[PDB]
Paper text:
The [name]-containing cullin-RING E3 ubiquitin ligase (CRL2VHL) complex is an E3 ligase commonly used in targeted protein degradation (TPD). The VBC complex exhibited heterotrimeric structures of [name], [name], and [name].
To determine the crystal structures of VBC in complexes with coumarin derivative compounds, we attempted co-crystallization and soaking with each of the 25 compounds (2–5 mM of 25 purchasable coumarin derivatives). Successful results were obtained using soaking for 7HC_1(DE22) and 7HC_5(D3), and co-crystallization for 7HC_2(D7). The 7HC_1(DE22) molecule was modeled in three chains (B, H, and K), VBC−7HC_2(D7) was modeled in all four chains (B, E, H, and K), and 7HC_5(D3) was modeled in only one chain (the K chain). Hydrophobic interactions between the benzopyran moiety and Glu102 were missing in one [name] structure (chain B of 7HC_2(D7)) but were retained in the other six [name] structures. Hydrophobic interactions between the benzopyran moiety and Glu64 were observed in chains B and E in 7HC_2(D7). The 2-oxo group of each 7HC derivative formed a polar interaction with the main-chain carbonyl group of Glu102, and the 7-hydroxy group also interacted with the side chain of Glu64. When we superimposed our three 7HC structures with the VBC−MB235 complex structures, the ligand-binding sites were identical.
Author numbering:
A (entry chain B): 17 to 47, 58 to 84, 88 to 112
B (entry chain C): 63 to 132, 134 to 141, 146 to 172, 178 to 200
C (entry chain A): 1 to 80, 84 to 100
The structure:
C-alpha cells in the first residue's frame, strides 16, 4: 500500500503508507493523496528520504545528511509535520 | 541521579561508533556532571571506572545527545563495552543541529526561534 | 541485501527498496502494482543506459552501500512507441541567507 505526497511545485512522491504515517500531521491529512502547498519538491524529497532512513535504522547508524541550502526550509517543514 | 560509591573497580572501553567528538560525562556522588577527555570519531579508550557508576555521552561541541548501548551507561561486574552511537534524531532536531552549526546565536516563525535557542544541555536532560 | 531507490519519470518519484539480487523485470513488476502499467510498456534506466529485464540490480550498479536509505539511487522510468526518458528536476533551493 502506497500514498501520494504532492509538493507545492507539482512533484508527486509515492511512498509506502506506513512510512508516511511516521508524521502525525500526514496521518490526519490522510484520515489517499496529500497536497503540500508550502513544501517544494527539493524539501519533500528529503522528507521521504528521512522516512526510509527512520524506518530502517529504528548496526551503526550513519548521519542523516542535510545540505546547508535546504536546512531552513526542511526545518520549517519538519516543524509543521512534527517529524 | 548519582553514582553509587561502590569502590568496586569496573573495566570499561569507551567505543565511539559515531562521527562526532564524544564527550564522556560522569555523574559523581552528588549528581554533579563531571566531564572527561573527549574521544575523536571512530576511536576507543579503555578507562577505569567502578560498578554502579553513571555515565552519559554527548557531542563535545554541541552537546547533542548520544546513545550508549542503545541513554545511561552503568558499568557492571566484569571489560565492559560502551558502544556510543548516533541516535535516530527527529528530522526537526536534526535540522536544528545543522542550522545551529551555520548561524551564530532568520525568516522563520517565532516558535522556532526559541527552539534554536533551546540548545541541548546536560543539566536540562538530567532533570528529564 | 536491500537497495533503496527512487523510480522517477516526469514529475513522479517512487521511493521503494529491493533486493540486490532482484531483477530489472521484477522491479518493473513493482512499478506495475503502483502505476498500473505492465512491464512490457516500461523502460528502466540507470542514468542514460537502458536496463535489460534479466539482469540483477547489483549487476546494474545498484549496491546496498550506494543505494542507501538516506540517499537512494535513481532509476529512470519511461512509458510506452516508447516516449523519451524525461525526468523533471526538483525545484531549486534559494540563496544562502
Ligand atoms: O518547505 C517548507 C518551506 C516553508 C517556507 O519556505 C514552509 C513554511 C511553512 C510550513 O508549514 C512548511 C514549510 O515548508
Amino acid at each position: 500500500m502506497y500514498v501520494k505526497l504532492i509538493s507545492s511545485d507539482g512533484h508527486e512522491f509515492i511512498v509506502k503508507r506506513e512510512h508516511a504515517l511516521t508524521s502525525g500531521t500526514i496521518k490526519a491529512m490522510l484520515s489517499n493523496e496529500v497536497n503540500f502547498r508550502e513544501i517544494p519538491s527539493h524539501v519533500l524529497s528529503k522528507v521521504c528520504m528521512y522516512f526510509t532512513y527512520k524506518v530502517r535504522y529504528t548496526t551503526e547508524i550513519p548521519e542523516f545528511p542535510i545540505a546547508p541550502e535546504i536546512a531552513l526550509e526542511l526545518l520549517m517543514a519538519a516543524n509543521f509535520l512534527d517529524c | 541521579l548519582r553514582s553509587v560509591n561502590s569502590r568496586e573497580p569496573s573495566q570499561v572501553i569507551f567505543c565511539n561508533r559515531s562521527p562526532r567528538v564524544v564527550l564522556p560525562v560522569w555523574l559523581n556522588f552528588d549528581g554533579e556532571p563531571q566531564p572527561y577527555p573527549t574521544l575523536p570519531p571512530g576511536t576507543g579508550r579503555r578507562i577505569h571506572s567502578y560498578r554502579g557508576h553513571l555515565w552519559l555521552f554527548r557531542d563535545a561541541g554541541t552537546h547533542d545527545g548520544l546513545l550508549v548501548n542503545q541513554e545511561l551507561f552503568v558499568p557492571s561486574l566484569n571489560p565492559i563495552f560502551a558502544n556510543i552511537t548516533l541516535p535516530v534524531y527527529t528530522l526537526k532536531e536534526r535540522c536544528l543541529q545543522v542550522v545551529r552549526s551555520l548561524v551564530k546565536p532568520l525568516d522563520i516563525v517565532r516558535s522556532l526561534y526559541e527552539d534554536l535557542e533551546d540548545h541541548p544541555n546536560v543539566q536540562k536532560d538530567l532533570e528529564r | 541485501m536491500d537497495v533503496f531507490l527512487m523510480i522517477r519519470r516526469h514529475k513522479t518519484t517512487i521511493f521503494t527498496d529491493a533486493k540486490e539480487s532482484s531483477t530489472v523485470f521484477e522491479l518493473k513488476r513493482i512499478v506495475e502494482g503502483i502505476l498500473k502499467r505492465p512491464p512490457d510498456e516500461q523502460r528502466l534506466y540507470k542514468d542514460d543506459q537502458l536496463l535489460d529485464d534479466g539482469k540483477t540490480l547489483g549487476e546494474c550498479g545498484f549496491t546496498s552501500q550506494t543505494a542507501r536509505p538516506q540517499a537512494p539511487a535513481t532509476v529512470g522510468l519511461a512509458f510506452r512507441t516508447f516516449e523519451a526518458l524525461c525526468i523533471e528536476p526538483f525545484s531549486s533551493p534559494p540563496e544562502l541567507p
